[PDB]
RNA sequence: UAAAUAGUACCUGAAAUCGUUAAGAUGGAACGGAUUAAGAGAGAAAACAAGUAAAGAGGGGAAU
RNA sequence: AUUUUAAAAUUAUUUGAAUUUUUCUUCUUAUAAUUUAAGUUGUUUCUAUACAGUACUUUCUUAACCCACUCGUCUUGAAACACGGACCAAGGAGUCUAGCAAAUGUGCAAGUGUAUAUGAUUCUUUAAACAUUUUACGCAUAAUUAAUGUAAUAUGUCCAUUGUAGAUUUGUGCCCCACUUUGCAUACAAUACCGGUAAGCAA
RNA sequence: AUUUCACUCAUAUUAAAUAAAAUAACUCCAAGUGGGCCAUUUUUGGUAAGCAGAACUGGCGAUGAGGGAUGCUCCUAACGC
RNA sequence: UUACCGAUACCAAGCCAUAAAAAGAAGAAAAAAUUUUUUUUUAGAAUCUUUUUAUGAGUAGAAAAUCGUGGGGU
């Protein structure tokens, strides 16, 4: 069932699963266009793992943007200074690869910068 | 730089003030029509004679099954008429040789004549008409009278009931007025029809075929 | 002659040691040129394409002024300077330069 | 340049890109042009209509470097030398230019062209051509053999 | 579904966008579609379209052609989209303005000696936007030898198409079909 | 244009009269034949329906 | 010895498989697609609170 | 942020008139706002006066109504009483070369390519880059016939063959169409001219 | 028969009607294909066949959705969320 | 004979993608406190930005945008 929450509006949830990802452990739950002959899928029979298609993709006026109404940055050392103007739109995330003291001092400088940060307890 | 804003409104004021005079005539004509009907029928009634009324020159026609398992002639014309969806309509204008070729597309179509109230309606509810340039027509609501002014305002037919009478008489205006027109979409009736495989005119209960003057009552419900 | 502003945006808005693309979110895109205003990736506002312009940075701790040939100086002191070399952008320069102080 | 490849774009799709139901076998017609006259001479004759048969007497060492004779249209004449030397030329009406042809590396004189009237050339050629010569005279030019 | 020919979606055919990834020429075709955008001349229209035409269809045009097409009104000023090449044919040249992407070093000479100027597209542009006082000219597009390859194919009755070989001797396609006394004949 | 909420051109009084200049004149016309007294129907049922 | 969950099959130690504990389900297949409802886990970046006065810890830069 | 404006209607004035003959009667002269114009706005609560919970969002497991035949394959016809597949992890298949053609991009352009090879205070990287005294060759500039060989208007003029349309172009009625001016490219023809073979003549 | 001149033959709805008629026309490169089958109607051989073989058209294959309990071809109808 | 139930067909609306289409190479708005401060923006990227319409099935088959892997200059 679609989603809705205030303004973005999400049409699917639920990521899609390979077929037969069930019964056989050597197919893994990505999932892949099955080409097949009598492949069920492909035929869209009633009711059995239905596939993703162009139609489900969410409005390009909301598209990307993040529950917090803000689309997400990655930083990595000391990149900030492309923040200071747009810190209404983008919300900073720190990169799985920095220590605890670069991190700190990353936190610091956001958080008296005034934007938010998505993992703000890593490693600490 | 600034008097072409007042002559442009000047403009559009005659336009409607001569709109209102073309509607008051229409409406005189309208009722000059069903009283000479009305009085002739009575005149043939008192005397021994007897009056008909020529069919009405302008039919409406619907479609009724879907796209699949069609002869190529009957597809290709289809296409030649604008009849591309299951639950289009369009008018057209009564020749022999128009007739002749309805013939080979009876069983799949409903057509009759339209009478004044259901064409009104036809026009303002579901009309949509041709904007942009040729072969790119970008098709749109009415909603005013801009666009009809200025691709067929040149034939002094600006306006919409302009279009209401030309389209109810068979007038000078219909190579334009029709190609103009977008081809009518129409919702499923109301109660539904009687039967898709069979005639109207079969005894047993039926749809397909010449309607006459019962069209208006199915398209009351088309709407 | 040879090169233009004009000419030099067709060279820059590709292959560019300025250039940050966001990878998470795909409609970020970042300009780090140190002559911009805003970070936006535009021929209109980057700094190395504009015939003359100006902003404000920081440089290792402190805030860094410059003015394109490529002058480097050290509020009312900031707005002084900008109406010395004054040329919407000149408001929006002097809050970006409010907000960029408080930061240590 | 592997990643370009048509290949490269039909990973998963059993097929390959050449065919299901015909399957892609290993010289299906016939190796190189096998199919002449029994199976494939369609082509030949749609294609190649002169391809088989044999015309003509025999060259037994033909040695190539005899015959040997580059070309040279009538009217290239004036382009060959420098366009000054053409424009002193042209002006002047007791001087004319001698082009000594095998110098440049050329062999015969073909009439082809048209040259600019009341201005004689003096040429200098291994061959010549009848209608090069009667347009070289026409023109006060002279042809003058040399080997 | 519809009853339209190719799903109801109108199909062109031709460039949508320079494939020529050229900085100064990508620059002078996003000039020359905005003049043609704005004005509603079909000069600035068509000479954009001719910018965008692959290498095969901007052909060279020789000084002996452009003079002689000039011959008739001698005032005006031609617009090329592809290159001119000097011919060395060609005796004398009179005073002719011209417009080309390309040149050639001796060609630029003959020009210039002669007293015209070589006229880019950019002051084609600065001096007349309008097309006005210019003619339009192009080379022989069909003229490449690889067009002796097409039409009818080599083999058919009544047909002038160069058949691929390795060689123009005596032993290659010279007996079976092409000549009576082997067989039929073309 | 921006295209808005298409105005129903059959009961939206203001976009039905912008559409047909005499709409308002016509349904006054309508009220007028509408709003009359019983009594002159009451006295002349029988008047035409004898002739 | 820094680590012995590095102890001579000795860097990391996934999968098929098996074991333990817990929770749940169990009337000739199991697993699933779409819609939920209940449970059990987690979760603050929109899921209310900017500033305003005071005091504790810090910090910075301009002015001389 | 230069059509959410115009008018369109409504109210309340005023203007003249009208007619179906008047409290939704109509047509505007002039005024100020309303919106049925010109895509849903307002009011009261709750979340809630808290920093993780039973609420709230989400993952997972269970159930519930409806549906759902093992995939891959050759095949007109696959779930088949057609064949391979007990399971897992790793490896596993349109590549390379010579030659040609076509499409595209680039340089140069009647020329093009610098081949073998040559010189240099280049001589870790340098088995690369640089450079090439006033016809070396390939491919192209002209074709054709087995072949001796022959070889593209023709000196009236540095006009450059002729038609039918045909892009532009200069103007007459700074944006259309009809009138004369140029006639790209090309398309369909016609003409000449070169080789070849016929035929007539023929020293 | 040709060329050049006269003159002018609806063209403002357009030498009948109607046309999502320029989604055209052409040229080039190239893959797959080259065992078919079912259905109304016509029809050949055979007694007949879910047979063998053809004919105008539509489908199946290449395709699911609702119905015929169920079905490769029947009826409605062809699929973005 | 009415009334009904009944589709991924039809109609109205929303969103996606493709194709076409119309058009484009520089300025202050609002709210909250109390005239002054604070609070959000103040946009111009042509294989782009804004907007309109139509359409949306597919095996063999072809093309485009793409997402990853071992390396290499930058």
């Known amino acids: 069932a679609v989603k809705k929450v205030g303004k973005i509006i999400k049409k699917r949830t639920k990521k899609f699963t390979r077929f037969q990802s069930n019964r056989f452990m050597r197919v893994k739950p990505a999932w892949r266009k099955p080409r097949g002959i009598d492949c069920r899928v492909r035929r869209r029979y009633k009711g059995t793992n239905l596939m993703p298609s162009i139609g489900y993709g969410s409005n390009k006026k909301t598209k990307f943007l993040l529950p917090n109404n803000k689309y997400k940055y990655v930083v990595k050392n000391k990149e900030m200074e492309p923040l200071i103007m747009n810190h209404t739109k983008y919300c900073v995330q720190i990169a799985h690869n920095v220590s605890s003291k670069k991190r700190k001092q990353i936190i610091e400088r956001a958080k008296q910068m005034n934007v938010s940060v998505i993992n703000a307890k890593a490693r600490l | ?57 302008v039919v409406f026609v619907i479609r009724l099954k879907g796209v699949n398992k069609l002869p ?152 | 002659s040879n090169v233009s502003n004009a000419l030099v945006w067709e060279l820059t808005r590709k292959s560019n040691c300025f250039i940050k693309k966001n990878k998470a979110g795909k409609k970020g895109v970042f300009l780090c040129d140190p002559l911009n205003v805003n970070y936006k990736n535009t021929p209109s506002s980057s700094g190395l394409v504009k015939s003359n312009s100006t902003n404000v940075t920081l440089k290792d701790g402190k805030v860094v002024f410059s003015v394109k040939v490529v002058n480097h100086f050290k509020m009312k002191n900031v707005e002084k300077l900008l109406q010395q070399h004054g040329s919407k952008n000149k408001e929006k320069l002097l809050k970006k330069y409010k907000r960029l102080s408080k930061l240590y | 340049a592997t990643r370009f490849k048509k290949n490269r774009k039909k990973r998963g799709h059993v097929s390959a890109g050449h065919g299901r139901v015909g399957k892609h076998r290993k010289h299906p017609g016939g190796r190189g042009k096998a199919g002449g006259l029994h199976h494939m001479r369609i082509n030949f004759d749609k294609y190649h209509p002169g391809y088989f048969g044999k015309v003509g007497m025999r060259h037994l060492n033909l040695l190539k470097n005899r015959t040997y004779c580059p070309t040279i249209n009538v009217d290239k004449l004036w382009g060959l030398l420098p366009e000054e030397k053409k424009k002193e030329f042209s002006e002047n009406k007791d001087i004319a230019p001698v ?26 050629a291994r061959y010549f051509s009848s209608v090069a010569e009667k347009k070289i005279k026409a023109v006060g030019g002279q042809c003058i053999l040399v080997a | 579904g519809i009853a339209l020919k190719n799903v109801g979606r109108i199909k062109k055919h031709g460039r949508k966008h320079l494939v020529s990834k050229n900085p100064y020429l990508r620059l002078l075709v996003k000039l020359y579609n905005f003049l043609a955008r704005r004005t509603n001349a079909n000069f600035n229209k068509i000479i954009a379209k001719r910018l965008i035409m692959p290498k095969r269809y901007r052909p060279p045009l020789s000084l002996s052609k452009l003079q002689y097409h000039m011959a008739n009104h001698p005032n005006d000023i031609a617009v090329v989209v592809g290159s001119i090449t000097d ?66 194919a080599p083999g058919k009755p009544k047909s002038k198409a160069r058949p691929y070989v390795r060689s123009k001797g005596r032993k290659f396609e010279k007996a079976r079909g092409r000549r009576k006394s082997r067989a039929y004949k073309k | 244009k921006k295209r808005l909420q298409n105005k129903n051109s059959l009961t939206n009084f203001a976009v039905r009269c912008r559409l047909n200049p005499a709409y308002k004149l016509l349904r006054s016309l309508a009220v007028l034949r509408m709003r009359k007294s019983i009594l002159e129907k009451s006295k002349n049922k029988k008047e035409k329906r004898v002739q």
């Open chain 2, 1 to 57: 730089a600034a008097k072409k804003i007042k002559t442009l409104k000047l403009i559009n004021k005659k336009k409607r003030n001569d709109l209102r005079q073309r509607t008051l005539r229409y409406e005189e004509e309208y009722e000059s029509e069903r009283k000479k009907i009305i009085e002739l029928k009575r005149e043939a009634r008192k005397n021994n004679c007897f009056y008909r009324e020529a069919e009405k020159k």
């Open chain 2, 72 to 223: 190529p002639k009957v597809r290709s014309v289809f296409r030649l008429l604008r009849l591309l969806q299951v639950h289009n309509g369009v008018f057209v204008k009564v020749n022999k040789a128009t007739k002749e070729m309805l013939k080979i597309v009876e069983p799949y179509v409903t057509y009759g004549y339209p009478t004044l109230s259901t064409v009104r309606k036809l026009l303002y509810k579901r009309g949509y008409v041709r904007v942009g340039k040729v072969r790119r027509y970008a098709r749109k609501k009415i909603q005013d009278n801009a666009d009809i002014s200025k691709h067929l305002g040149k034939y002094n037919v600006h306006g919409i009931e302009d279009m209401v009478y030309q389209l109810y008489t068979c007038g000078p205006v219909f190579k334009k007025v029709n190609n103009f027109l977008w081809a009518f979409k129409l919702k499923p009736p109301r109660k539904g029809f009687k039967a898709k495989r069979h005639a109207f005119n079969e005894p047993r209960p039926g749809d397909w075929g010449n309607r006459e003057a019962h069209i208006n009552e199915l398209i009351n419900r088309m709407i």
């Open chain 4, 99 to 124: 082009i000594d042809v095998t110098r440049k590396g050329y062999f015969k004189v073909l009439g082809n062209g048209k040259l600019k009237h009341n201005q004689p050339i003096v040429v200098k």
């Open chain 5, 87 to 152: 011919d060395k044919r060609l005796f004398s040249l009179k005073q002719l303005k011209v417009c080309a992407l390309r040149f050639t070093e001796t060609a630029r000479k003959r020009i210039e000696d002669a007293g015209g100027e070589c006229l880019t597209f950019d002051q084609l542009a600065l001096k007349y936007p309008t097309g006005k006082k210019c003619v339009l000219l192009r080379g022989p597009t069909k003229a490449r030898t690889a067009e002796k390859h097409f039409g009818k």
